[PDB]
Every structure is written in C-alpha cells, then in structure tokens.
Scaffold this motif. Structure first.
Motif, short mmCIF file in Angstrom:
data_model
loop_
_atom_site.label_atom_id
_atom_site.label_comp_id
_atom_site.label_asym_id
_atom_site.label_seq_id
_atom_site.Cartn_x
_atom_site.Cartn_y
_atom_site.Cartn_z
N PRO A 70 0.38 -1.30 0.43
CA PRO A 70 0.07 -0.31 -0.16
C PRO A 70 0.79 1.19 -0.12
CG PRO A 70 0.11 -1.70 2.15
CD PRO A 70 1.12 -2.09 1.49
N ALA A 71 0.39 2.25 -0.76
CA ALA A 71 0.64 3.29 -0.62
C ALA A 71 1.18 4.26 0.82
CB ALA A 71 0.12 4.71 -1.31
N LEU A 72 1.23 4.82 1.46
CA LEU A 72 1.06 5.59 2.09
C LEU A 72 0.86 6.80 2.77
CD1 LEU A 72 4.25 3.85 4.54
CD2 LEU A 72 1.98 3.41 3.94
N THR A 73 0.64 7.60 3.54
CA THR A 73 0.36 9.00 3.74
C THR A 73 1.25 9.56 5.29
OG1 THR A 73 -1.18 9.03 4.52
CG2 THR A 73 -1.29 9.58 2.56
N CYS A 74 1.92 10.66 5.60
CA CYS A 74 2.30 10.95 6.45
C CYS A 74 2.02 12.36 7.01
CB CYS A 74 3.99 10.88 6.29
SG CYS A 74 5.03 11.66 7.11
N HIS A 75 1.59 12.42 7.55
CA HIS A 75 0.95 14.13 8.65
C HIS A 75 1.76 14.20 9.93
CE1 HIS A 75 -2.47 13.15 5.76
NE2 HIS A 75 -2.24 12.09 5.90
#
Ligand SMILES: [Mg+2]
Length: 356
Positions: A252-257
């Motif tokens: 999966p793609a990840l997002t970081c916040h």
C-alpha cells in the motif's frame, strides 16, 4: 569478508559526497552510524542479519533517503535500527534502541523529556511487532544531525493502534491532531523529532489500501492544501497508472501527516509515499519512474544516479528493491521535495520479475 559496519559506512561515505558534505562532517556521521549499529557493526556479512527487522526487505538495519530540490545537492538521511544487535526479541531490541538514542541526545544537547513521557505507551512489557524503535538521522552540514525516533503504534496490539496514536498526540499537547487525520487502514509509524522544540514535532504515518490517483490528491489535511493535480500526476508516474480503474492494491501507499505547532490544530506537512518496488519488474524501471518525477519537479537526476552507484555496483535491471519508495513531500511555507528511499542491500538482492 566484509563487515556490516564496513559496507554501511562505505555506502554512507559515498552518499555524503553526493550530498556535498565536507570530509569532516562525513567523518562525524560515519562514526555515528557505526556507534548506532553497536556490536552489529563488526558482524560478517556472511552471517544472517542480526535481526529480522522490518526496516528493509532483506533485514539490513540501515536504509538511506535523498530529498531532492531544484538547484542544490540532495538532503541525505540515514535510518537505522540501533537495537538490532539484540535480535528479534522486541523488548530487548527496544531497550537497546532507547539507550543508543539517549546517548545521542546527551551528546548533542537534545531533551528526551517528550520521549520519556511516551515510553510506557510504546515500550510495554510484552510488545508486539513489527518494530520497536528506529532512528532517523538527518545528515546536515555542521555535523550535528536532526534526530527522529520511529515508534510502533501497534506495540500494544494492532487493535490498539488508533488508541495509542490518539494518546500519544494528547500527551504531546497536540490535542486536535488525531481528529484532523484522514481515515486510514493502519497506523504504521509515529515519528517524534528529538530536537528542543517548543511545540513537539511529530509525524503520523497512515496506510491506505487500494489508493487511486484522485485519492492521493484528496488525503492531505495540511494547511494550505497541496496541488491536487501535481499529486495525481506523481501517483500515476510512480505507479505506472496513466491516463479511472487503476489502484495500488499490492503493497500500500502511505501518507505522512506532520504537526509542528498546536494552535492551528492542522498538520503542516503531507507526504505521499509510493512503494515503487512492488509495481516494477526491476530497478531499471523504478529508476525510470524516479527520473520522470525528478524531471517534472525541476530537480537534477545525475545526483540520483550517483546515489545509486554509491550504494551498489550492480546493474539496476538485475534485481528489484534498491529503490524502495518514491515520495512527494509538502511542508507549509517550504518548497516541495521529491524523496528517493535507497536500500543498502547488504543481505539480499531480490530477483527481477517477468511481469509487474
Ligand atoms: Mg472534529
């Protein structure tokens, strides 16, 4: 036969040249990397990895990244598992990692008060995987690195990951941050900067199964919102999903916040991480995608080629996974960066594939 610390520091020395760091700073950071590996620095590469770490696919307890900007050399970071010499027992690996990080902090004058406050949450007596502690070192000019600590929201069980992240953010004083995040399918990492910052600087990584290009443009929560079109284009280039029905439904793609202040209640950064290694046949293709993204963002790719040669002499087409991830990095008030995650490959080269 070569020792793990010797390969890793040779890679690091050659990468510090790509980053334009002085001989002096390169010497400082090679020492820090050796120290952080502990007894594993002296370990022959003919023996198994010291731990079956999730830090990399072949369990090398080192990974590099290079953050590219127009008109200057890339910024270099090294990620290490400092408790790797303790092996697969996560309590001992975590305890050893913590000791190494406290030694660093004492040396550079960083406060560990925020980390100490989170210890009972991330280091319970019988921790669950897949990690206990990694350390990310931003290798800045001057020889004093930025230090971030990567912790495991699933330490208390995967079913308690959201609760663990909510509680961490509350303890750090980021009392609106959790509810500010988009929905996700998991919380793989929490990263805490160990600098002496008034508002703690904390990054939340989220996993997204089956993400589309449009989704990549709609997951930011940072103020101000980044360009949707630029995000969609990056996703399609990195995933080779041109044009509707395309999704990244393998790895999966990840997002970081990222949160750097508490008053707005909103993230100040958003990064989209695409695991390009699972969507190519070999590293020749992953490089082609990296070169395309860099060209679109007006950053010079000759440095990428030097960086790949710095970590490995092999032909790119003879394996897959050298380029682990490609990331598009947005931060409030700062220029956008393209980051390439580059594997050490100290233990295995994954074979090339006939098809994606
Ligand atoms: Mg709300």
């Amino acid at each position: 036969e070569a020792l793990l610390g010797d390969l890793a520091t040779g890679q690091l020395t050659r990468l510090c040249e790509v980053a334009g760091l002085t001989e002096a700073d390169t010497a400082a950071y090679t020492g820090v990397l050796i120290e952080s590996l502990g007894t594993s620095a002296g370990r022959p590469l003919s023996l198994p990895p010291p731990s079956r770490t999730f830090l990399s696919d072949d369990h090398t307890p080192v990974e590099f990244s290079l953050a590219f900007l127009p008109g200057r050399a890339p910024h270099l970071r090294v990620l290490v598992e400092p408790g790797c010499s303790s092996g697969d027992d996560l309590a001992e690996n975590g305890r050893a990692g913590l000791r190494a990080v406290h030694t660093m902090a004492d040396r550079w004058g960083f406060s560990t008060e925020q980390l100490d406050r989170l210890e009972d949450l991330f280091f319970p007596s019988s921790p669950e995987g897949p990690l206990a502690l990694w350390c990310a070192l931003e290798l800045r000019s001057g020889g004093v690195p930025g230090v971030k600590v990567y912790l495991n929201p699933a330490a208390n069980g995967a079913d308690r990951a959201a609760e663990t992240v909510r509680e961490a953010l509350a303890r750090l004083g980021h009392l609106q941050a959790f509810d500010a995040l988009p929905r996700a399918d998991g919380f793989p990492f929490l990263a805490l900067d160990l600098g002496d910052w008034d508002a703690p600087r904390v990054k939340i990584y989220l996993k997204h199964l089956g993400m589309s290009a449009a989704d990549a443009g709609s997951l930011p929560r940072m103020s101000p919102a980044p360009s949707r079109e630029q995000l969609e284009e990056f996703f399609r280039t990195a995933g080779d999903l041109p044009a509707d029905t395309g999704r990244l439904a393998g790895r999966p793609a990840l997002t970081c916040h990222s949160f750097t202040e508490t008053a707005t209640g909103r993230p100040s950064g958003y990064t989209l991480h695409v695991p390009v290694r699972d969507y190519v046949r070999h590293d020749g293709e992953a490089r082609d995608r990296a070169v395309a993204v860099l060209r679109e963002h007006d950053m010079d790719s000759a440095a990428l080629d030097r960086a790949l040669a710095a970590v490995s002499p092999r032909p790119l087409s003879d394996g897959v996974g050298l380029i682990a991830y490609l990331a598009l990095v947005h931060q409030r008030g700062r220029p956008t960066r393209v980051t390439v995650y580059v594997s050490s490959e100290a233990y295995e080269v994954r074979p090339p594939r006939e098809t994606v």
